[PDB]
Amino acid sequence: KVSSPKIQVYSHYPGEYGKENTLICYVSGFHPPDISIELLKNGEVIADAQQTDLAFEKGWQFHLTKSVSFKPEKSDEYSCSVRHMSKTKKIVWESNM
Numbered sequence: 001k002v003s004s005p006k007i008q009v010y011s012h013y014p015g016e017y018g019k020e021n022t023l024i025c026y027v028s029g030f031h032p033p034d035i036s037i038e039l040l041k042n043g044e045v046i047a048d049a050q051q052t053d054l055a056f057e058k059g060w061q062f063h064l065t066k067s068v069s070f071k072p073e074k075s076d077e078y079s080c081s082v083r084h085m086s087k088t089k090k091i092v093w094e095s096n097m
Helices: none
Strands: 006-011 021-028 035-041 055-057 061-070 078-084 087-092
Touching: 006 078, 006 087, 021 035, 021 078, 035 061
Parallel strands: none
Antiparallel strands: 006 021, 021 061, 035 078, 055 061, 078 087
16 A cells, blocks of 8 residues: 655755755655645745646656745755655755855
């Protein structure tokens, strides 16, 4: 039956403050292929995020990408919120900084 999503959150370019960038969430390895993804800014859903079509590879692996433009500042927490089998997991963007 079941396997939990792997959730990876990153930016397209180096995540320096005040610079326009893209926040990306890559979600993979989940069974069943029934999932939802949201990108959050301080715990609030970011609008106009775009999600790839569900991909399916090698007879077993599903993956999805959700992305949105963002401008990271010091005090703001960006995250990816993924609900699978009615359980939500939140993964914070690890800026560094």
